[PDB]
Fold Spike glycoprotein.
Amino acid sequence: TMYICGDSTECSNLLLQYGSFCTQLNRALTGIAVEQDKNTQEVFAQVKQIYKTPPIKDFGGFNFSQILPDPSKPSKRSFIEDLLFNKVTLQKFNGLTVLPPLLTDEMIAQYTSALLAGTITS
Amino acid sequence: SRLDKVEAEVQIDRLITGRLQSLQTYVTQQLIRAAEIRASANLAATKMS
Amino acid sequence: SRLDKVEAEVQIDRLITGRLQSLQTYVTQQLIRAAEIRASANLAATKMS
Amino acid sequence: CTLKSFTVEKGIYQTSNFRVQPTESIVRFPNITNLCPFGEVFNATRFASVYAWNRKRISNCVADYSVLYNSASFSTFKCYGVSPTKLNDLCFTNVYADSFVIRGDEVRQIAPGQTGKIADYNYKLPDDFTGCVIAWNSNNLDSKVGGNYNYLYRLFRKSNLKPFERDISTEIYQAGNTPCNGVKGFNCYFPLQSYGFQPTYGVGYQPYRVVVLSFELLHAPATVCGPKKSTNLVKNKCVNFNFNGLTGTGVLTESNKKFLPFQQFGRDIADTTDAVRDPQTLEILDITPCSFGGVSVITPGTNTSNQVAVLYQGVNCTEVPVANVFQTRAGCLIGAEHVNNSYECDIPIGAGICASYQTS
Amino acid sequence: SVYAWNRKRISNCVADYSVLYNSASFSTFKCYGVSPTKLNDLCFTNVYADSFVIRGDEVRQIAPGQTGKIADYNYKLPDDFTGCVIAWNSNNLDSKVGGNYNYLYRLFRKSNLKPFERDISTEIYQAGNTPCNGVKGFNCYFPLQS
Amino acid sequence: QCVNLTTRTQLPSAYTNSFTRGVYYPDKVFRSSVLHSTQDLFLPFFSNVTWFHAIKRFDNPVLPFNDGVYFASTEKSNIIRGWIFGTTLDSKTQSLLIVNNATNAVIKVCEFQFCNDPFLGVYYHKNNKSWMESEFRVYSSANNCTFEYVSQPFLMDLEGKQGNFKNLREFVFKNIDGYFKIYSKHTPINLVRDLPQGFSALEPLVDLPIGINITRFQTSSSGWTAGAAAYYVGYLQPRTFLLKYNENGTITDAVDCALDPLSETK
Ligand SMILES: *[C@@H]1O[C@H](CO)[C@@H](O[C@@H]2O[C@H](CO)[C@@H](O)[C@H](O)[C@H]2NC(C)=O)[C@H](O)[C@H]1NC(C)=O
Ligand SMILES: *[C@@H]1O[C@H](CO)[C@@H](O[C@@H]2O[C@H](CO)[C@@H](O)[C@H](O)[C@H]2NC(C)=O)[C@H](O)[C@H]1NC(C)=O
Ligand SMILES: *[C@@H]1O[C@H](CO)[C@@H](O[C@@H]2O[C@H](CO)[C@@H](O)[C@H](O)[C@H]2NC(C)=O)[C@H](O)[C@H]1NC(C)=O
Ligand SMILES: *[C@@H]1O[C@H](CO)[C@@H](O[C@@H]2O[C@H](CO)[C@@H](O)[C@H](O)[C@H]2NC(C)=O)[C@H](O)[C@H]1NC(C)=O
Ligand SMILES: *[C@@H]1O[C@H](CO)[C@@H](O[C@@H]2O[C@H](CO)[C@@H](O)[C@H](O)[C@H]2NC(C)=O)[C@H](O)[C@H]1NC(C)=O
Ligand SMILES: *[C@@H]1O[C@H](CO)[C@@H](O[C@@H]2O[C@H](CO)[C@@H](O)[C@H](O)[C@H]2NC(C)=O)[C@H](O)[C@H]1NC(C)=O
Ligand SMILES: *[C@@H]1O[C@H](CO)[C@@H](O)[C@H](O)[C@H]1NC(C)=O
Ligand SMILES: *[C@@H]1O[C@H](CO)[C@@H](O)[C@H](O)[C@H]1NC(C)=O
Ligand SMILES: *[C@@H]1O[C@H](CO)[C@@H](O)[C@H](O)[C@H]1NC(C)=O
Ligand SMILES: *[C@@H]1O[C@H](CO)[C@@H](O)[C@H](O)[C@H]1NC(C)=O
Ligand SMILES: *[C@@H]1O[C@H](CO)[C@@H](O)[C@H](O)[C@H]1NC(C)=O
């Protein structure tokens, strides 16, 4: 209703005769909205017991410094994925709203540490 | 604000028939892309597992 | 039952446009969903075999 | 009611979207000042006569009819094309203003589609007259004790001339078949006779100064018409503004953008209005519509209990009572008790927050 | 009159519109919601017998949705009016040598009114901005006009 | 009242290329750091424009006015004083008149009886170093006038500035739905005769709702000496430009989509 006949009474009345189109759209956009959380749920949470690396780094001459999380940053991100977050380039008047994801961007980086800490010692 | 109500609805019948036609195209595009992402997400799940 | 052949020609036209658009949307909705199950059916075959 | 059932399941449901209705409406337009002097015409020292009624140009001014009409010094006021009240809004390409003085008994000849001496000899009107006829008594000013013989009228004319046709012919009229020669003779009559106005003359014989505002429609850009207005400006509450036809609803806030001297509006990549400049006192302002968002109803199963909570998708709850609190990036949730112990997610909300039914 | 138009309820009867459609006395026979040839096969919930007299050249505004003095002030047809409008020249039956001043119309009134509204009020309309009391005065004109 | 200037030699329309001149503000809207495309009447880039040689050399010919017009004037001392626009130019129909003199830029709208040779008289040059308006030898009568306009008083130097052209005056005229538009801009330059290479903007001046039809336009009593003038006449057709606004609302660059395939791709 807001997009088609924003802030007008008469326009909102003639749209009524067209039946259930307005209901049909809102379910369609909701169907993909819920689905998106299911995807990032599926690919990242394959481990449920969140491991953490030991402080020692005597890994037989290897160093995993670029991939092990750096505590210095305000978010627990490592060297590599700081480059990626800088490379990418990215509320509105007419009803267009953006909804936040369920998993906050800091939450995902915590999973990948467990997936990485587990595979380097176990 | 320019024409009387006897045919002011006739003009806005065009926009109603029109603006809906534009919204139908945008939503149908999203469904196609959403189905395309699933192929990548389900493939990525296999890579991780 | 209420109007003769001349003005009945006009009203019936806008019903068909209204109903035909309704039938078009349902078909394009089925096709997207039917494609999804095709992906699920293939996966079941791989696990079964 | 939305789910069309008497039992609702555990989960989060989006129904009955929300919008903050604007409080009231504000109007803003620039300054309007250029008034052409109707004063020097209405208060003019001497008016023209009906035999050679004068036409004068009215151009590039404001035709404020409020002071024109509300004055009680006028005698009659009759508009024949439009209602007298609404001349101030419908703008006129041009206005024909004529000033002339006649007898009070001849004023019924001024009306269109009428029979009369001045209706037929000098001042005829078309069958589709649109102007407004205004007259006022001026006996005490025009009259002279010895007779004010300045005014003249067409006693005789060869034919009835067309509407709004001005002529200066003054040759001796030929009443009979024989031609007229010289200044005097048989069937030789002076086409002009002089009005005599006296204080002893009653209604009908008095001198009545008459003015008509006739106008021609839509053959050139509009030039002269009535006045307009604007109100005081307000900020920090979403209202329905009208800046030179820019109707819209949103909150008014001072901004940091800087226009050019002639620049007026603002637009983004989305091609929409984003910044407007006040046409009265030059400043730059932002327009952002006051908040809206879907209402979300959080509940456990119907069988389990009846208590619920409502969420506002992306809506600030500093302005929630328009329709316990807690602020989240996804919106502001009310009706729920915040705790600190962390569990598994039961029903998602957004931004990492998950609600659950727990202890009473 | 157009301000006092008469209404008479008719129900529980069988209606013969065939004579109305085949009568030659009607100068105007134009229906909006129905066509007159199918009408004898239809059944009505109620009958609204609205009747009045107007000028001969005053019939355009009778169509639903129009604007002007009549449809603005004293008689309305709703935007979705369903029925038939009937008229016929009646000079010999409604005109007189001295003038049929017996019928009035709403020249002035405050605003636009709801459809099928009836009013006979004779309170003087305040056209001018100055307040008006009594029954007469400059720019104090009674709404009816002869 | 006019006197014909018959002591005039016919000059061929010598051709010169207008590199990047003639871009202006089509609408009164501010937008920052964006690339807006518009479809209006504009002077093409690098287009063969007519260059006029004025010294001896003063031909005052009638030119057709279609889909707007362009004007440029590499001038000193402002010999250019104005223009007319109309359809009949013989007092039968209303025609536009723009006159810029030492006192006011006056706009007069009447059925002007346009004489063949319009020009303004100035105190000749005998010994006195004074220059001001003397002759209104542009038209004879203005009977049925509808629109007039006069700007605020100012004094413009009519002294006979010599040397290379220092002040750049570029003026654009259009008519849309009766509205009359005039655009102007002033900027310095140092070059001999030709148009410089560079980018600039033309600012709007005033809008006039005249509403008269226009199809053709025109820019002791014999023998006069004129300063060296180099002005140009260009014609406008519907075209698409890609205007680059900065964050300040001042145009920095423009590309004509219809010039070459590279422009089409951009
Ligand atoms: C582990 O290996 C890495 C890379 O081979 C080493 O990283 C650099 O080490 C030097 C020596 O102090 C530092 O100056 C650099 O700043 C390090 N690189 C970065 C990107 O910071 C690291 O020192 C090694 N660690 C150990 C304990 O040997
Ligand atoms: C909801 O609105 C309030 C007030 O409009 C916001 O609180 C303001 O936050 C800014 C940023 O620090 C401060 O400068 C103001 O002083 C605050 N005002 C008040 C009254 O507290 C709040 O940030 C908004 N919340 C969201 C999520 O947008
Ligand atoms: C100035 O020159 C124009 C023509 O360049 C003269 O216009 C001519 O006038 C005569 C009679 O007045 C006509 O027979 C011609 O047909 C006109 N010529 C054109 C081209 O139309 C004009 O009369 C001259 N005026 C003066 C004062 O010399
Ligand atoms: C430049 O042209 C304008 C326009 O005609 C002249 O302004 C007129 O000036 C006289 C006397 O100064 C006034 O009586 C007129 O009323 C003015 N015209 C208008 C339309 O108001 C101005 O004088 C001219 N300047 C020179 C130096 O010739
Ligand atoms: C502007 O005024 C002129 C002259 O006052 C008008 O020309 C007259 O037009 C009428 C009929 O249209 C003729 O009978 C007259 O003979 C014309 N006068 C002259 C001197 O030729 C002209 O029509 C007016 N403009 C408009 C648009 O009406
Ligand atoms: C936009 O305009 C502002 C103001 O004119 C420019 O800021 C000026 O920049 C110049 C040189 O950089 C300084 O000399 C002025 O003092 C500045 N004035 C102000 C008020 O800041 C700004 O540079 C312009 N934008 C760009 C991209 O140049
Ligand atoms: C809801 O609760 C009732 C008990 O009041 C129970 O009988 C019913 O099975 C419950 N519903 C479901 C779906 O379990
Ligand atoms: C939860 O932790 C916060 C620390 O930011 C504290 O202020 C709050 O009191 C805690 N909750 C309770 C119930 O104590
Ligand atoms: C400009 O002039 C040159 C030489 O006179 C000519 O070749 C060219 O075609 C002209 N421009 C156009 C657009 O025709
Ligand atoms: C210069 O002007 C004065 C007065 O204006 C005049 O007397 C003199 O003759 C002029 N100079 C010449 C060379 O004519
Ligand atoms: C100007 O002349 C054209 C020529 O056909 C005509 O169509 C147009 O109506 C005229 N303009 C006016 C205002 O009469």
Observations:
- The CA atoms of residues 80 and 86 of chain A lie 11 Å apart.
